[PDB]
Structures are given as C-alpha cells and as structure tokens.
Amino acid sequence: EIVLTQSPGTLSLSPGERATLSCRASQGVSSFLAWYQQKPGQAPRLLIHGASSRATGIPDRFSGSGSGTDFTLTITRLEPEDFAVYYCQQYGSSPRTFGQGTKVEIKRTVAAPSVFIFPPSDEQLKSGTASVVCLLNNFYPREAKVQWKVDNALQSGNSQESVTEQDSKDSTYSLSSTLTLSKADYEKHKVYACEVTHQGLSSPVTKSFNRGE
Amino acid sequence: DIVMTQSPLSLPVTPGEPASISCRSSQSLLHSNGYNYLDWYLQKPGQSPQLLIYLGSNRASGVPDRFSGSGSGTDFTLKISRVEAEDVGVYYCMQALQTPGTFGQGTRLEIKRTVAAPSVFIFPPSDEQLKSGTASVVCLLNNFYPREAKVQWKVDNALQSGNSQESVTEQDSKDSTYSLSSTLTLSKADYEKHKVYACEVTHQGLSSPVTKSFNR
Amino acid sequence: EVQLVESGGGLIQPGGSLRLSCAASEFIVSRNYMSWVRQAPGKGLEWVSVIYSGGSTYYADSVKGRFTISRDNSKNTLNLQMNSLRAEDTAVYYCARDYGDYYFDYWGQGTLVTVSSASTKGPSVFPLAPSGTAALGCLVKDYFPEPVTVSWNSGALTSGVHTFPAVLQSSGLYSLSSVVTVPSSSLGTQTYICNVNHKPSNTKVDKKVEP
Amino acid sequence: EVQLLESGGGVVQPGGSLRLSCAASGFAFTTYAMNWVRQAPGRGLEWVSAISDGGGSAYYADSVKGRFTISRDNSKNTLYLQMNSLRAEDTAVYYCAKTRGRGLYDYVWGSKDYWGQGTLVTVSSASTKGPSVFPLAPGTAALGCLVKDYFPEPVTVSWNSGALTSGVHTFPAVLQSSGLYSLSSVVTVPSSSLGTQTYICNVNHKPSNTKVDKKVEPK
Amino acid sequence: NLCPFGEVFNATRFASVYAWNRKRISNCVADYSVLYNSASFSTFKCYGVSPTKLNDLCFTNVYADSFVIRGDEVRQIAPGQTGKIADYNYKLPDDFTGCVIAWNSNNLDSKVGGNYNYLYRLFRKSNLKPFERDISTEIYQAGSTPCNGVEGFNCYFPLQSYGFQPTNGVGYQPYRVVVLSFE
C-alpha cells in the first residue's frame, strides 16, 4: 500500500495569510492525488483532484501542485472558513489511501484562561465516587498545563483532561480536567487545588477549596 | 441568420452597483431538449475572450457567483450583482443553435468611477530623433476619469491643428482610470524656429485648464 | 438536491451483524461507482469497499470475508452487510459517490457504528455548582455509548456554553462535562438546567444547577 | 493544463495565401470539436469555421466559404486554417477555441470553453520595417519610450526586463500618414529616485527581429 | 506466405483500448520463434498452448488484437479478471486459448505535457461480453435527470484520456499489448 505522510501535522496561521500544506508519498503515484477538507462533526469535502484540478464550486485561492511523490496544496488568502483539517488521498495503486491530516488552526493574540474549580456533588458522593473538575475558559495558545494539588501534594496519574475545538467567535480554546478518587480517598484529604500555567499568565494561577467547608 | 441585439452598447455602472445587459434574438434559441442555447463571453482589455455563461444560465468554470444568466426563448439577460473594477471589458452574447455562429455587437461595461483629474507631462523630442530630421513632442495625460478631455497644442502661443496624433488607453482594471498621449509632429526645421512648446489640458476633474510647457 | 443519507448505525456486540444503508436522492446508485469510507473517532480516513457501475466489487483487506457491498435498484439504495464485527470496526461510516474508482466527490453525513461488549447504560448527571462572571455546568458520567447531547435551559441559553468531547475512562464508560458562563448577579434569581439526552439508551435527565 | 498555441500569421500580400496553426497541449484534443474565431482591429468577434473531432464535419462562415479550409491533424494535435485569396477584410486577430461540450446536442460550432491567445494576420501591400526607439526624458516624475515608424504590428515594451510593471501605460499604436505605426510607453516613478535609479525600456518587434534597449534618463 | 505478424507488432500507431484493433490471420505460415526470442516482451503468458511448441500446431484461424493500456493493467488482459479494462474495454473469455504479450512503449507513446490520444472507457452501465466491444460516445447518465445530449453534471463523457506522462513510475507508463487467439 502507498503510505501517505502529511506535514506539518498542525499549522497555526492568521486569516489573510498564506498556507502551504505538504503530502509526500511512499512511492510514485504520478498525478493521481486528491485533497479533502473536513470540519469537525461533518463529512469531508473534495477540493482538488488530479493533483491540480479544482472541484466544482471550489474557490480559486485553493490550488494543487506536485507529481510523483511530492505534492502541495496552497491556500492563497486564508478566509475565516478555510480553517479545518485537510487530507490527501492517492488513487494510483493498491488500496486507495489517505494521509493522516493537517489541522489548520487560526493564530490570534495570547489570551489567558479564567480558572474555575468544582467540588463534587453530594449526589455523586453517595454513589461512592468523587470527581473534582478544573475549568480553564477561553484561552490561547492551546498549550496549557494543569497541576492538581491535594493538601498541597502534587498529584499524578489520576486525572484526565479534554480540550474543545477553537471557538468560531473568538478563536479560543477551553479545557477541563477531572481528578477522580474513591469517596474514601477523597474524604481523607482537606484542600483540593488546581494550578494552571499558561503563556497569558505572569505566574501560575491556583484555585482551591476546602472540603470540610 | 439569427440576429442578436445587445442593449445597451455602453453601460456605465458605479462600483458596487448591479448591472444588466439585455440580448434579444431573431429566432427562439429554445432547443427541443429544454436548454436555451445562448452564451455570454467577456473580453477584458488586451486579453482574448472568455466564457461566462453557457446554455443561458450556467456559469462557466471559475466564474464567480455574482455573474448570472436568465431568460428564455428570445429575451435573455446577463446580470452582475456587484460590479467591480476587474469586470471592465466588452461582453458579447452569442447563439449556439445554428451554423452561422452570430455574436451580439458587444456591450462596453464602463465603471462610472469618481472624477479624477489627469497628471500632465510634456516631453521634448530626443536628440537622437533630431539627427534624423523630425521632432515629436509628446504630452501625457495620466490616470484621469472620465475619458473625456481636450488637449491643445500651442507653439509660441499659437494654436496647432492637423499635426497632432493621440491615443487613449482602455480603462484600467484596478483603479478604473484612463491615460492619454498626444504627439505633435514637426520637422526639425520648424521645431528649431520656435522656443516655447505648450500643452493645454481641460478636463472636468480640475477647476481651470492646466498647461505644461518647456523652452527649446 | 443531490444527497446521500446513511442509516442503520448503532451499538452491536462483537461478532454480531449490522446492515448499513445509504439512500441516494437525485443520482442513481445502479449507474455509479459507490464506495464506503470509514473514520475511527479522532483518526484518519480508511477506504472500505466499492461497487463498480457495472457490478464488480472490491474490498479493503481488513474486511474481506466479513463485509458485503450491494445495492437495491428499486429503492436507489447502497448497502453494506457487516458480519463478524470487531472493536477495530468502531467508526463513522460514510457512503460516497465515487468518481471512476478514483476520488470521492460527494459524501453523506455518516452513521456511527459502535461495536463493544459493554451494555447500553444511560448517564448519571451531577451538578457543577457555581461558586462579575460565573461558571457552572453538568458532569455527564458513566454512559454508553456516545452520542450524548447537552443543552442549557432547553436551548434558550446557548451563549458561553462549552461541551467537551467525551473521554473513555478505565472502566470502559463515557464521561463528559458541559459548562456555561453566566453573570454572577444572576445566580440567585435565574434558574439553570442542563438537559441531557442519550438516545442510545433512550434516556433523558434534567437537573437544576445551583449554588 | 489546457493551452492552445496559434502560429503562422504575419503580413500577407492581398490575393495571396496563408496557413494558420493551433497547437493543442493538455487535454484530450482528439475528442473535442474545434473552432476558429476572428476579430478585426477595433471591432467584434466573428465566427469563421468549426470542425468536429477527427475531421469529417466542417462548417464555414459565409464570408470565407471557398477561400478557407479548416483541417485537423489528430496525430500531433494540431488545428489548421488554410487561407486562400486573402483580402483587406481578412486582416484580423485569429484564434482557435475549444468547444466546451462533447455530446450530441453540444454542437461543433457552439459553446467555446478555452481560447488561445491569438495570431494577427495583416493583408497589406506594405513592407515590414523595424521601429526606432527614442527616450521621453523627465515629487513624482514621468518618463518613457517613443517607438516610432514600424510595420506591421505588434510591438511589445517592457521596463527593466520586466522588473518594473507598477505604473506603466503602453498606449495603443496609431497609424501615421506614412503608413507606419507609432506608439509610446510611459511609466510614473517617484521623482526622488531619478537620481540613482535606472530605467531601461526593452522594445521587441518580432515581425522584423528588432530588439532594442534604450536607457531613459533626465537630460 | 508469412502471416503478417510484422504489420501487427511493428505497427506505427496502436489503437486505444476501447477501440482495439483486430486482425484476422488466414491462409499462411507464421513463425512463432521470433516472438519468444525477443528481449522486449516483459509479458508473455499463454493459455491453452505452450509458447515454444507454437511452431508445431495448426489452427483454422488466428486473431491478433492490439491496443495500449497502463502497465498496472496488463494484469487484466487474462481470463477471469475484473477491473476497468476487463469490464468496460477489453474482456477475455474464461476458456481462452491464446497468448498475451506486452512491452513498455514509453519511448513511442508518452510525451512531455502528456499524450492524450490514448483513451479508455470509464463509464458503462454493464460489463462487456468477451470480445464484445463498443465504440460509443453517448454521454453517461449518472442521475435521474436525462442528459439530452449535453455534457455536464451527472452527465459525463464516457471516455477518459490516459494522459501518458514521461516521468512516472513504471506502472503508469504505456504498454502496447498484442493478444493472439487460436480457434
């Protein structure tokens, strides 16, 4: 099978700027290459075929180049609706195969998150499980670090986090972190805290609560 | 043959404003198969023509959505919902039914742009040319709108006539202005028995006529 | 006016059977190259199977002997019979009009096929009580399988709502949080309810979230 | 990828003959009908001829029947226009244009999807003459080149080998009483740069293999 | 009488696969040694007969088909195959008795910019009967709307050009193919 390698894996640009996506092929596929655009939650959309032919209704700022093993897709003047994942797909041999993708994210100014910590409900405690939730709201860039502190001891390997997709309005991310414990291990500790490190913060920001309160 | 009648032959449009070109046909172009066999072509200045609409209502490959074809039988219409500077050029309709392929007379889309007065320059003849016995004095009216201007030569403040050639560019595709050059041809004998050569430009864009001159 | 609409997705045991169906609107499956393409959650695109305009069929090596592509001409339907379903096979399945066995120029919205040994369990919904600007939410925990849909005040409140992608925790269940930002001054007076709907388990929960 | 290269076409003495070529490039030329369309200087498009794929069917405008021959070499992808008994009313820019569709009712003479850049044909008694280039010497200045006394058309003028495109107007040529053409080409620059910048106009008159560089500078 | 196999193999032009040529060969003697001893025939597979022993057999007719395809597709010029060549352009019978030879023709059939003369059928509503080949150009209706003889959306010209490009990998180069049938 032709193995299709796409780079860069992710690409942060600003509306109006120029985008150059690359897709290299494990062996010759001549001109038999297509490019697709996929937005989150909906089906992919054909942009070009034959390495350089625009599909029907595809704006002209999209353009394809390459032959053999090295192909590139170029968006000339990035519009706010051109920010998605782009796949290449060879149809020269074997099974037809797709690249692994390239996320084209909008870059904007640094935005710091506002931090919220949520103690578990009495209803959930009855079930025997405690879930502490730390919320980081509307920030950029995406890379943030969350550190859980239980009675000021740094925790590790007992929490899971989840990021949103860029907000269409203000181009920001949000993030939640969920520390999970048994009712027992939860109830034997006093102060739960969440420490957030992010470029938009001069020094990390802690939100905390006392569980006996 | 089928006669195609275009209206109007010149269409002034303000940038952003919609435009409409009418095209009427001798016979009905409605084919048995439901399609009206009318095409719309555009020829931008200096380029070769280009398909906009085919079979009456279908935009050609690459054609923006603000271009639009409608009508049936003998009355058709091309509409540009937002006219912009790149659209300047000549539009031709054409029937595609029968063997005499016949075009409309063409419609010159003008872009009714805001009044801009010309920059005026005058160039004496080179010395190279004066060796070979003649002299060309060139006056340049640059980036003006509308196209209408009077240029007037004076040699020692004496009006000229009959020895003046001029040429006007087509409307620029970015800023929608015109440029003009006027050439006053004389013999070297005549050109060196006067000293002041003046070019006088009157244009709606300025208050009083502007004069550029040089002394030989 | 052109359209491809999949159906028949859902939760099925390992080693069970499931029959996907794709209904075409304006353009005839019997005269077209039709294909199935699948996408595992958070992963790339894999071609599965194709049927030629004239009848030939081809399959990805991972699904030969288990999948069968076919079509109902009297109903303009593309079909995929899937037997011996595995974990690997959990994905979103797309039917696509296939231009000459080359590229896929028109896609349907897709259908989600979850193949797991777990059982359809509706979620437990807990309040994330608010403690100017204020944050509040609902923890939607231990359901199976996605999707689940959160809304706030029956949809009358969409501004400032974030719902996070679900996470599969070690237990093998699904957990997500949905949060909304509201003014602090509104906390006592305004009432805030998340509306959790989990159609796979046929389950619906409303809870008041409050300080 | 589709492109259509016209060749042939220069000055032809009246009553004489000429053969136009159109070289097709990046498409299934063998499957499409072809067209020749004509534009006389200062006027509109006139259709002249059409030919189906692989020859066989040809069509001609009234004004060229008996004198013109459209033909096709599907071997090496070339279209031909044989022009006999040429006339003043045949002086025009000629270009091949590819028929858009390929179905039964798309028609050989019909919608034309891609057009070539064209080739100019001049029916005239006159003799070919290369031009003479003279400078038009100069907080914003004008300068340019006068390209005088040449036949036939066209003449191309670039500035600094193409590096200077912003601000250039090359006017249409005018026909002087001598029978020869004349044009000028001007460009606007910041006056503050007339000191140290250099402006060279490159005139190219292919019909006579004339190629001239004149540097233009404040006298 | 030498059977005119030189006219077939050393032909100047070859046919497109959808329009493959056939030459009936009758009333002569043919020298099959000159074929198996050719360094050029990358493919030389024979069905129902043995290649060496082909100078010791007699038949009442011999048929010679020639066309150009991609190297990736010579795999399909064999009994019991499927794919766009076997199904819509050139189909051999299950009970084939003959030989199929091919040879890379990059030097004669590809050029820079692409040679678009060679064509294959892309759209056909039903598989082709063996040796049963259509020359048709009617546009292909892929929707419920009739096309009314006008190429457009869901209304595709049934042929497509190979666009033979000189640079490609070997599987994409043109291959001239000759099929000999023995009956």
E78 in the same domain as E14: yes
Fold category of D4-123 in CATH: Immunoglobulin-like (2.60.40)
Q: How was this entry determined? A: X-ray
Strands (E), C40-191: 46-51, 57-59, 67-72, 77-82, 91-99, 103-107, 111-115, 124-128, 133-143, 149-152, 161-163, 167-168, 174-183
The verdict on A131 and A156 lying in the same domain is yes
Cα separation, C139 vs C145, whole angstroms:
16
Candidates E16, E18, E150, partner chain D, best to mutate (most D CBs within 10 A): E150
Domain end (from B74, B93, B111): B111
Determine, for residues B169 and D188 on separate chains, whether the beta-carbon distance falls below 8 Å. no
Selected residue of E138, E139, E147, E148 to mutate for chain B interface (largest B Cβ count, 10 A): E148
**CA Rg, chain A, in Å?**
23
Choose which CATH entry (2.60.40.10, 3.30.1490.100, 3.50.30.30, 2.40.50.660) describes domain D132-216.
2.60.40.10
Question: Rounded to whole angstroms, what are the CA distances from B199 to A53, C105, C165, D173?
Answer: 53, 63, 75, 21
Q: Domains in chain A: how many in total? A: 2
Q: Give the C-side interface with E, CB within 8 Å.
A: 2, 26-28, 30-32, 52-56, 100-101
Please tell me whether residues E70 and E52 are part of one structural domain.
Answer: yes
What distance in Å separates the CA atoms of residue C178 and residue C181, rounded to the nearest whole number? Answer: 11
Please tell me the distance from the alpha carbon of residue D51 to that of residue D36, in angstroms, as a whole number: 9
Same domain, E129 and E40: no
A163 touches chain C (CB under 8 A): yes
> How many Å apart are CA D155 and CA B67, to the nearest integer?
34
CB contact under 8 A, C169 and A160: yes
Note whether B129 and B99 are same-domain residues: no
Residues B106 and B124 in one domain: no
C-alpha to C-alpha distances, B100 to B94, C36, D59, D62, D64, nearest whole angstrom: 11, 49, 9, 8, 12
Residues of E in contact with D57 (CB under 8 A): none
For A140, which DSSP code?
B
User: C-alpha angle with apex D73: D71 to D77, nearest 5 degrees?
Assistant: 120
Q: C26–E144: do the CB atoms touch at under 8 Å?
A: yes
Question: Chains touching chain B at 3 or more Cβ pairs under 8 angstroms?
Answer: A, D, E
Q: How many CB pairs under 8 A join D and E?
A: 49
> Gaps (C–N > 2.5 Å) in chain C: which residues precede them?
131
CB E62 within 8 A of CB E103: no
Nearest chain D Cα distance for residue B122, angstroms: 9
Q: What is the dihedral of CA E116, E120, E124, E128, to 10 degrees?
A: 160
Indicate if E66 and E135 belong to the same structural domain.
no
Q: What gap in Å lies between CA A73 and CA A58, rounded to an integer?
A: 13
Q: Answer yes or no: do B124 and B86 share one domain.
A: no
Distance of CA B10 to the CA centre of its chain: 10
Could you tell me if B101 and B132 lie in one domain? no
CA distance D146 to E96: 77
Q: How far apart are CA E151 and CA B91, in angstroms?
A: 25
Q: Phi and psi of E18, rounded to 5°?
A: -65, -20
The reply to whether B97 touches chain D by the CB within 8 Å rule is yes
Phi, psi for residue D167 in degrees, rounded to 5: 95, 10
CATH number of C124-209: 2.60.40.10
Does domain C4-115 match CATH 2.60.120.260? no
3-state class (DSSP) for residue E14: coil
Q: Do domains D4-123 and D132-216 have the same CATH topology?
A: yes
Task: Give yes or no for B86 touching A (CB within 8 A).
Answer: no
- As given in the structure block, the two tokens for residue C197 are 């709907």
Q: Where are the domains of chain D?
A: 4-123, 132-216
Instruction: Tell me how far apart the alpha carbons of residues E20 and E85 are, in angstroms, rounded to a whole number.
Output: 12
Q: What is the CATH number of the domain that holds A188?
A: 2.60.40.10
Number of domains forming the structure of chain E: 2
- Which residue range(s) make up the domain with E69? 1-113+166-183
* Beta bridge partner(s), residue D60: D49
Task: Give the domain range for residue B176.
Answer: 119-215
CB of D26 within 8 A of CB of D49? no
Last residue of a domain, one of A106, A122, A154: A106
Name the domain boundary from B79, B95, B111.
B111
Cα–Cα nearest to D111, from B93, B30, A184: B93
CA–CA distance from E153 to each of C2, E141, E146 (Å)? 11, 9, 11
Tell me how close the Cα of D15 comes to any Cα of chain B, in angstroms: 25
Tokens of residue D118, six digits: 């064209």
Tokens for C32? 């077209």
What would you report as the CA-atom Rg of chain B, rounded to the nearest whole angstrom?
23
Determine the Cα angle at B180 with ends B177 and B182, to 5°: 170
Residues of B in contact with E152 (CB under 8 A): 58
Residue E58 tokens read as: 């007699």
Q: Enumerate the residues of chain A whose CB falls inside 8 A of the CB of residue C170.
A: none
Q: What does the block give as tokens for D40?
A: 């006389």
CB contact under 8 A, C44 and A42: no
Its sign, for the CA torsion D110, D111, D115, D120, is positive
How many residue pairs from chains B and E have C-beta atoms closer than 8 A? Answer: 8
C-alpha dihedral over A179, A182, A184, A189, to 10 degrees?
-10
Q: Which of A88, A178, A180 to mutate to test the interface with C (most CBs of C within 10 A)?
A: A178
End-to-end CA distance of chain E: 20
Q: ∠ CA B164-B166-B172 to the nearest 5 degrees?
A: 165
- CB of B61 within 8 Å of a chain E CB? The answer is no
What distance in Å separates the CA atoms of residue B141 and residue D187, rounded to the nearest whole number? 12
**Does residue B15 have a cis peptide bond before it, meaning omega lies within 30 degrees of 0?**
no
- Residues A100 and A134 both lie in one domain: no
Q: Which residues in chain A have Cβ-Cβ distances shorter than 8 Å to C99?
A: 49
3-class secondary-structure state, position C132: coil
**How many inter-chain contacts (B to D, CB under 8 Å) are there?**
125
Q: Is B215 on the interface with D (CB under 8 A)?
A: no
List helix spans (H) across chain A: 122-126, 183-187
HEC-encoded secondary structure of B78-134: EEECCCCHHHCEEEEEEECCCCCCCECCCEEEEECCCCECCEEEEECCCHHHHHCCE
According to DSSP, the β-strands at D174-175 and D181-190 are antiparallel
For chain D, the residues whose C-beta falls within 8 A of a C-beta of chain B are 35, 37, 44-47, 50, 59, 61-62, 95, 100, 105, 107, 109-113, 115-118, 132, 134-137, 140, 142, 144, 146, 148, 169, 171-174, 176, 182-184, 186, 188
The stretches of chain E forming alpha helices (DSSP H) are: 6-9, 33-36, 84-88, 106-109
How long, in residues, is chain A?
A: 213
Q: What is the DSSP letter of E11?
A: -
